[PDB]
RNA sequence: UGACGGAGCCAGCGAGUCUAACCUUGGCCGAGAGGUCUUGGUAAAAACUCCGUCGGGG
């Protein structure tokens, strides 16, 4: 359980940016 | 006067028949498919003649290419030794196109 | 001073492939010896 | 004062090739003789220059 | 300088010089039973247990040039004329001999 | 602590999705700090795995690409029999650029699984051997030495081969993995394979490698990495990366 | 050029074709270092030279 | 059986005789057949010949064995001023 | 200087230039010794203008020839062609008329197109 | 009416600072535009002679 955990990682941060 | 000496006809092994006339490379690359060279290098395995007929060469020595055979992995021998309504998508699509224009 | 001071009295290179001395293959005694 | 050393030794030879060359340029029956190593010499007949 | 020595369906040309295999023949379905030169050298000959004969052309083992077809009893004996030269005088085990022209 | 549960959970989840079910190997990311400033070319420099062997040459189709008469390089590792069984195909260019052109150079790719080229004929290779060989890191042709002779200047060098040392060799690129430079920061070794071998195994290859990259010696191959390590990230081709060590 | 090479008249004589060379591959050779005379040296100004 | 003349020898001819015991003994017409030589090739033979009688090379004796065997046997056999002056 | 004759020899799109220089007897082409031209079932053809008329005219002299252009069998035609008007040409400079004489009514009675050019220039009919 | 290797051997036209793909997996930097590197997938002289080898199709 850490997979999509860390695809929500990267998502989130380029939608922040 | 009597000379001393020392067959059989088309063969089974692996639960697959094998030549009786040709030689021996023919024969372990007819048992199903494998390569020529790879049955050069089995015959080395064996240290047997290469051109040997098939009506030669005995069962002891056809068991020990019978082990080698099953066992590809345990004697060092490697692998390369061993081995449409999209269409109806499209013309539908097709006929919708040319309703439209000749329609239009 | 004692070596250049006794003067005035007295990784396999190459010249043309300098891909090689990056390139070359290291190679070890078990990688030598180790008969597979 | 080792590079000044390395420097003569070196003009040196050059001297010695330029030297042999100009000398089989002027005149007498020379031979060439070639070594086992590979290097070449000559060497003139007998006879006196006039 | 070299010699023909037959085997099981195998006719080998040895040499002489260096006494090693120099040519084999090996296209004969059972096994093949006398191998013999010509006269002049040219010609090898060569009958087998099916009843045929090949004459063809030796230290040319890929042109088989000539196939006479004896008895289909065996033919042991397949000898070329030595005073003639283009008699081939075969054998059988046909209890016949025959002198063939080639 | 943090990697063999990435790992795990990248495993795990490589077996059950559909496309990343198809790939077998990972890729490591060190993203130095400062750029190395050596330009690229595909002259792969190899890095060598002290505790475990990644592949067998017992197992893989292998291509040798060699010198023009090719004469002597046939005969030898086919009759030497400690590499008779070990080369699927040899070819000397003249050979390849004659036989090979069009797209069964695209069947030559998928056929063999890695290609070995003699040193002095690998910078004139990428023509021939063409353009979908240089992807990435998976079929870039190696370079060997094969006659174990340097050529001193002026001095015609002597044509040889011994066939002890070419499988020696092979050996060596065989059972380790290498990298190839970047003019950037971040770089992705081959390490790993799914079924091969496990946890541990790729622990300790990670180890080793980030050990030989931050080594100060070895200065064509070791003292490479020019500024701060940061980070290493683990994932197959597929994927998407799983993060390490980020201080 | 190529309606000159047309025209060519392949029976043209000029004078200095007696100085003017050519190949075997048929366009013509000139000199690098200027003259008819300017090719190659002799043995008295080599030697001096030297 | 096999038979060659006029060879280089103190035998001018030969008739070489083979025996189904590893015995190939060679005889000659001109001493009335009496027994010259042998050897004892191991098996049975089935074969035996002397290369022929213009052989200019080295001979050879081969005999060949019913277990499939050839024995052979051979017998073998400065400057240009300087040489003016 | 030397005595040198130069000729040439023409099939299809091939050349053949042709040097005679009187020498000591040797013949070659490209570089290689006429026993080497290639294709090896015309080499006979190539022999043709020496086993014509005897190989004494040529040991007398050294033939030495250039070719290009064409494939096989025309850079074949090409040498011997060039190769007959050499020794023809060299004899009428150097040598007798006479012997110019014999040796063109030699290579004329066998083959006049050791001489002069096979041109099958076309024809609208 | 040939396969498969090697080895020899020969053309004639072409010469505009212009000649040429598509997707992809991720890292870094930038406020963005984008830039840099990384990873995988799909598109793009022959005959001839010579020497050995071989002897219905998915």
């Known amino acids: ?17 | 006067s009597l000379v001393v000496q020392e067959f059989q006809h088309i063969l089974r092994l692996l639960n697959t028949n094998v030549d009786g006339n040709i030689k021996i490379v023919y024969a372990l690359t007819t048992i199903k498919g494998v390569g020529r060279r790879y049955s050069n290098l089995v015959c080395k395995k064996a240290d047997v003649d290469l051109h040997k007929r098939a009506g030669e060469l005995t069962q002891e020595e056809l068991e020990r290419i019978v082990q080698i055979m099953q066992n590809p992995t345990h004697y060092k021998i490697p692998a390369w030794f061993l081995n449409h309504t999209l269409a109806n998508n499209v013309e539908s699509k097709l006929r919708d196109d040319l309703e439209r224009l000749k329609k239009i | 001073l004692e070596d250049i001071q006794q003067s005035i009295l007295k990784f396999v290179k190459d010249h043309r492939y300098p891909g090689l001395t990056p390139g070359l293959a290291p190679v070890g005694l078990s990688d030598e010896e180790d008969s597979s | ?50 | 300088h070299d010699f023909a020595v037959t085997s099981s369906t195998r006719v080998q040309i040895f040499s002489s010089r260096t006494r090693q295999v120099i040519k084999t023949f090996s296209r004969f379905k059972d096994v093949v039973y006398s191998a013999s030169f010509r006269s002049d050298g040219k010609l090898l000959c060569a009958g087998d247990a099916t009843g045929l004969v090949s004459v063809y052309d030796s230290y040319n083992p890929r042109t088989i040039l000539l196939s006479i077809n004896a008895s289909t009893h065996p033919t042991h004996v397949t000898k070329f004329h030595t005073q003639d030269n283009k008699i081939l005088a075969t054998a059988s085990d046909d209890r016949v001999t025959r002198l063939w022209d080639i | 602590g943090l990697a063999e549960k990435a790992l795990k959970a990248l495993i795990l989840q490589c077996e059950e999705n559909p496309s990343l079910k198809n790939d077998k190997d990972i890729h490591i990311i060190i993203n130095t700090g400062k750029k190395m400033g050596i330009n690229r070319d595909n002259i792969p420099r190899i890095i060598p795995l002290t505790k475990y062997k990644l592949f067998k040459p017992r197992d893989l189709n292998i291509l040798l690409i060699t010198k023009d008469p090719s004469a002597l390089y046939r005969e030898t590792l086919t009759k030497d029999e400690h590499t008779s069984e070990l080369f699927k195909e040899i070819i000397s260019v003249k050979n390849l650029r004659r036989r090979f052109k069009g797209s069964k150079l695209t069947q030559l790719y998928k056929d063999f699984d890695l290609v070995v080229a003699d040193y002095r004929v690998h910078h004139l290779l990428p023509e021939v051997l063409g353009s979908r060989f240089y992807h990435g890191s998976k079929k870039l042709p190696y370079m060997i030495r094969m006659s174990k002779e340097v050529k001193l200047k002026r001095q015609q060098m002597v044509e040889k081969c011994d066939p002890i040392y070419v499988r020696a060799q092979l050996r060596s690129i065989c059972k380790n993995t290498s990298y190839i430079p970047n003019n950037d920061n971040c770089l992705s070794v081959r390490v790993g394979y799914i079924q091969k071998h496990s946890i541990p195994e790729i622990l300790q290859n990670i180890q080793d490698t980030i050990n030989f990259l931050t080594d100060k010696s070895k200065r064509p191959q070791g003292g490479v990495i020019k500024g701060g390590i940061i980070s290493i990230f683990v994932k197959t081709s597929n994927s998407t990366s799983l993060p390490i060590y980020q201080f | 050029l190529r309606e000159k090479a047309k025209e060519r008249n392949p029976d043209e004589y000029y004078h200095a074709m007696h100085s003017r060379k050519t190949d075997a591959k048929g366009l013509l050779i000139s000199s690098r270092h200027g003259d008819e005379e300017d090719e190659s040296l002799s043995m008295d100004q080599v030697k001096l030279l030297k | ?85 | ?125």
């Not at chain 1, 359980?1 to 380029?14: A, E």
């Not at chain 4, 420097?7 to 060439?32: C, I």
């Open chain 1, 1 to 17: 359980d850490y997979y999509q955990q860390v695809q929500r990682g990267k998502q989130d941060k380029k939608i922040s940016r």
């Open chain 9, 1 to 125: 200087a030397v005595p040198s004759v130069q000729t040439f020899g023409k099939k299809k799109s091939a050349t053949a230039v042709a040097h005679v220089k009187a020498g000591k007897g040797l013949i070659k082409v490209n570089g290689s010794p006429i026993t080497l031209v290639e294709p090896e079932i015309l080499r006979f053809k190539v022999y043709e203008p020496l086993l014509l008329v005897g190989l004494d005219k040529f040991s007398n002299i050294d033939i030495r020839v250039r070719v290009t252009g064409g494939g096989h069998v025309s850079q074949v035609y090409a040498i011997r062609q060039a190769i007959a008007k050499g020794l023809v040409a060299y004899h009428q400079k150097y040598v007798d008329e006479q012997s110019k004489n014999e040796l063109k009514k030699a290579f004329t009675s066998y083959d006049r197109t050791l001489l002069i050019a096979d041109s099958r220039r076309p024809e609208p009919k």
């Open chain 8, 1 to 85: 059986l096999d038979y060659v003349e006029n060879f280089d020898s103190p035998m001018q001819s030969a008739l070489i005789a083979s025996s189904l015991d590893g015995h190939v003994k060679v005889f000659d017409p001109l001493d009335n057949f009496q027994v010259k030589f042998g050897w004892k090739f191991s098996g049975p033979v089935l074969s035996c010949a002397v290369s022929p009688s213009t052989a200019q090379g080295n001979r050879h004796l081969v005999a060949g064995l019913s277990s499939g065997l050839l024995a052979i046997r051979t017998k073998k056999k400065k400057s240009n001023n300087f040489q003016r002056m």
């Open chain 4, 1 to 50: 004062v080792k590079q000044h050393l390395q420097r003569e030794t070196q003009l040196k030879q050059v001297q010695q090739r330029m030297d042999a060359q100009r000398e089989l340029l002027k005149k007498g029956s020379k031979k060439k003789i070639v070594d086992s190593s590979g290097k070449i010499s000559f060497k003139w007949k007998k006879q006196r220059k006039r």
